[PDB]
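Interim report to the steering committee. The following record documents the input for Thaumatin-1 (207 residues).
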Amino acid sequence: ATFEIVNRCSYTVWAAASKGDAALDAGGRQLNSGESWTINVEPGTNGGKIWARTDCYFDDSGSGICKTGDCGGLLRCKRFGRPPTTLAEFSLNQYGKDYIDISNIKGFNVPMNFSPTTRGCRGVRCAADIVGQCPAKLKAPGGGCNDACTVFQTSEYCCTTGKCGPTEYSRFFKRLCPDAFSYVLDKPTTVTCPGSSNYRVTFCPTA
Protein backbone atom coordinates (compact mmCIF):
# COMPACT_ATOMS: atom_id res chain seq x y z
CA ALA A 1 0.00 0.00 0.00
CA THR A 2 1.12 3.61 -0.69
CA PHE A 3 0.78 6.35 1.92
CA GLU A 4 1.30 9.89 0.66
CA ILE A 5 2.36 11.94 3.70
CA VAL A 6 1.79 15.69 3.02
CA ASN A 7 2.86 18.54 5.31
CA ARG A 8 0.34 21.37 4.73
CA CYS A 9 1.61 22.99 8.00
CA SER A 10 3.33 26.43 7.78
CA TYR A 11 6.13 24.74 9.82
CA THR A 12 8.52 21.84 9.20
CA VAL A 13 7.56 18.45 10.65
CA TRP A 14 9.50 15.21 10.78
CA ALA A 15 7.07 12.49 9.65
CA ALA A 16 7.46 9.05 11.23
CA ALA A 17 6.01 5.66 10.33
CA SER A 18 6.36 2.60 12.56
CA LYS A 19 4.56 -0.64 13.54
CA GLY A 20 6.19 -0.44 17.02
CA ASP A 21 9.05 -3.00 16.59
CA ALA A 22 10.06 -1.74 13.08
CA ALA A 23 10.23 1.27 10.80
CA LEU A 24 7.67 1.50 7.99
CA ASP A 25 9.59 2.25 4.73
CA ALA A 26 12.40 4.68 5.77
CA GLY A 27 10.52 5.25 9.12
CA GLY A 28 11.02 9.02 9.11
CA ARG A 29 11.75 12.18 7.10
CA GLN A 30 11.87 15.98 7.29
CA LEU A 31 8.82 17.51 5.58
CA ASN A 32 9.12 21.24 4.91
CA SER A 33 5.82 23.15 4.39
CA GLY A 34 4.07 21.65 1.34
CA GLU A 35 6.45 18.67 0.89
CA SER A 36 5.04 15.20 0.09
CA TRP A 37 6.65 11.89 1.11
CA THR A 38 5.32 8.70 -0.49
CA ILE A 39 6.03 5.50 1.49
CA ASN A 40 5.26 1.85 0.72
CA VAL A 41 3.73 -0.16 3.65
CA GLU A 42 3.78 -3.98 3.32
CA PRO A 43 0.34 -5.56 2.94
CA GLY A 44 -0.88 -7.28 6.15
CA THR A 45 0.85 -4.55 8.24
CA ASN A 46 -0.86 -4.73 11.66
CA GLY A 47 -0.76 -1.79 14.14
CA GLY A 48 0.90 0.65 11.69
CA LYS A 49 1.19 4.24 12.94
CA ILE A 50 2.08 7.54 11.28
CA TRP A 51 2.64 10.77 13.16
CA ALA A 52 4.37 14.10 12.97
CA ARG A 53 7.27 15.30 15.15
CA THR A 54 7.90 19.01 15.85
CA ASP A 55 11.08 21.04 16.63
CA CYS A 56 13.62 18.35 15.71
CA TYR A 57 17.41 18.58 15.61
CA PHE A 58 19.24 15.70 13.79
CA ASP A 59 23.02 15.48 13.22
CA ASP A 60 24.67 13.90 10.12
CA SER A 61 23.98 10.31 11.47
CA GLY A 62 20.12 10.71 11.92
CA SER A 63 20.41 11.04 15.76
CA GLY A 64 18.91 13.91 17.75
CA ILE A 65 15.70 15.04 19.43
CA CYS A 66 12.08 16.22 18.83
CA LYS A 67 9.89 18.12 21.29
CA THR A 68 6.92 15.92 20.20
CA GLY A 69 6.81 12.32 18.91
CA ASP A 70 10.54 11.62 19.51
CA CYS A 71 11.20 7.91 18.79
CA GLY A 72 14.42 7.28 20.83
CA GLY A 73 16.30 10.24 19.22
CA LEU A 74 16.09 8.78 15.65
CA LEU A 75 15.18 10.48 12.33
CA ARG A 76 14.18 6.96 11.03
CA CYS A 77 11.69 5.70 13.71
CA LYS A 78 11.81 1.94 14.54
CA ARG A 79 9.66 2.51 17.68
CA PHE A 80 6.58 4.58 18.55
CA GLY A 81 7.00 8.23 19.34
CA ARG A 82 6.84 10.03 22.69
CA PRO A 83 3.12 11.10 22.66
CA PRO A 84 1.97 14.03 22.64
CA THR A 85 1.29 12.54 19.15
CA THR A 86 -1.80 12.76 16.99
CA LEU A 87 -1.83 9.18 15.51
CA ALA A 88 -2.82 7.92 12.09
CA GLU A 89 -3.43 4.20 12.90
CA PHE A 90 -3.88 1.37 10.41
CA SER A 91 -4.14 -2.40 10.17
CA LEU A 92 -4.04 -3.52 6.49
CA ASN A 93 -5.37 -6.67 4.67
CA GLN A 94 -7.07 -7.94 7.90
CA TYR A 95 -9.45 -10.70 6.66
CA GLY A 96 -9.87 -8.71 3.36
CA LYS A 97 -10.32 -5.26 5.02
CA ASP A 98 -8.10 -2.25 5.95
CA TYR A 99 -8.85 -0.52 9.30
CA ILE A 100 -7.87 3.15 9.77
CA ASP A 101 -8.41 5.63 12.57
CA ILE A 102 -7.10 8.76 14.15
CA SER A 103 -6.30 8.53 17.88
CA ASN A 104 -5.82 11.18 20.60
CA ILE A 105 -5.13 8.34 23.08
CA LYS A 106 -1.43 9.44 23.04
CA GLY A 107 -2.53 13.10 23.01
CA PHE A 108 -2.31 15.67 20.19
CA ASN A 109 0.57 17.67 18.63
CA VAL A 110 -0.43 18.29 14.97
CA PRO A 111 -3.87 18.40 13.24
CA MET A 112 -4.31 15.57 10.79
CA ASN A 113 -6.43 14.23 7.94
CA PHE A 114 -6.20 10.47 7.26
CA SER A 115 -8.02 9.67 3.95
CA PRO A 116 -7.97 6.87 1.39
CA THR A 117 -6.87 7.85 -2.15
CA THR A 118 -8.79 4.81 -3.51
CA ARG A 119 -12.63 4.48 -3.28
CA GLY A 120 -14.94 2.51 -0.89
CA CYS A 121 -14.68 4.43 2.41
CA ARG A 122 -14.35 7.92 3.93
CA GLY A 123 -11.40 9.63 5.66
CA VAL A 124 -11.14 10.90 9.24
CA ARG A 125 -9.93 14.23 10.52
CA CYS A 126 -8.83 15.73 13.82
CA ALA A 127 -8.08 19.38 12.79
CA ALA A 128 -9.50 21.37 15.76
CA ASP A 129 -7.03 23.63 17.65
CA ILE A 130 -6.57 21.06 20.53
CA VAL A 131 -3.19 22.65 21.52
CA GLY A 132 -4.74 26.14 21.75
CA GLN A 133 -7.70 24.86 23.83
CA CYS A 134 -5.67 22.26 25.79
CA PRO A 135 -6.59 22.12 29.51
CA ALA A 136 -3.72 23.60 31.58
CA LYS A 137 -2.75 20.27 33.30
CA LEU A 138 -2.36 18.44 29.91
CA LYS A 139 -0.29 21.21 28.20
CA ALA A 140 3.08 19.74 27.12
CA PRO A 141 5.77 22.46 27.63
CA GLY A 142 7.56 21.34 24.40
CA GLY A 143 4.28 21.95 22.48
CA GLY A 144 1.12 19.86 22.15
CA CYS A 145 -1.60 18.48 24.45
CA ASN A 146 -0.96 15.25 26.46
CA ASP A 147 -3.60 12.57 27.08
CA ALA A 148 -4.47 12.22 30.83
CA CYS A 149 -2.89 8.70 30.93
CA THR A 150 0.61 10.07 29.96
CA VAL A 151 0.26 12.91 32.55
CA PHE A 152 -1.36 11.11 35.54
CA GLN A 153 -0.53 7.41 35.01
CA THR A 154 -3.80 6.19 36.62
CA SER A 155 -5.77 2.97 35.95
CA GLU A 156 -8.85 5.05 35.04
CA TYR A 157 -6.97 7.21 32.45
CA CYS A 158 -4.79 4.37 31.04
CA CYS A 159 -7.65 1.78 31.21
CA THR A 160 -5.27 -0.74 32.85
CA THR A 161 -8.02 -3.11 34.19
CA GLY A 162 -9.72 -2.92 30.73
CA LYS A 163 -12.63 -1.30 32.65
CA CYS A 164 -12.84 2.49 32.57
CA GLY A 165 -15.10 5.33 31.53
CA PRO A 166 -14.78 8.61 29.73
CA THR A 167 -13.20 11.43 31.79
CA GLU A 168 -13.21 15.24 31.83
CA TYR A 169 -9.87 14.94 29.92
CA SER A 170 -11.04 12.32 27.32
CA ARG A 171 -14.24 14.44 26.73
CA PHE A 172 -12.14 17.52 25.93
CA PHE A 173 -10.38 15.54 23.12
CA LYS A 174 -13.75 13.97 22.05
CA ARG A 175 -15.62 17.36 21.99
CA LEU A 176 -12.95 18.90 19.66
CA CYS A 177 -12.36 15.70 17.53
CA PRO A 178 -15.41 13.43 17.71
CA ASP A 179 -13.98 11.30 14.83
CA ALA A 180 -10.82 10.34 16.88
CA PHE A 181 -10.33 7.89 19.82
CA SER A 182 -10.37 9.99 23.04
CA TYR A 183 -9.56 7.04 25.41
CA VAL A 184 -8.89 3.29 25.16
CA LEU A 185 -12.58 2.14 25.36
CA ASP A 186 -13.98 5.07 23.31
CA LYS A 187 -16.85 3.93 21.03
CA PRO A 188 -14.72 3.02 17.95
CA THR A 189 -14.23 5.63 15.18
CA THR A 190 -12.34 2.94 13.21
CA VAL A 191 -13.21 3.28 9.49
CA THR A 192 -13.43 0.03 7.41
CA CYS A 193 -11.71 0.27 3.93
CA PRO A 194 -11.30 -2.29 1.14
CA GLY A 195 -8.17 -4.43 1.58
CA SER A 196 -5.11 -2.85 -0.22
CA SER A 197 -6.56 0.69 -0.22
CA ASN A 198 -4.02 3.50 -0.65
CA TYR A 199 -3.96 6.54 1.70
CA ARG A 200 -3.01 10.16 2.21
CA VAL A 201 -2.00 11.53 5.62
CA THR A 202 -2.19 15.36 5.60
CA PHE A 203 -0.67 17.43 8.46
CA CYS A 204 -2.56 20.77 8.95
CA PRO A 205 -5.26 19.76 6.44
CA THR A 206 -7.14 23.12 6.90
CA ALA A 207 -4.37 25.51 8.17
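The domain at 1-207 is CATH 2.60.110.10 (Thaumatin). The committee is asked to note this result when reviewing the revised timeline.
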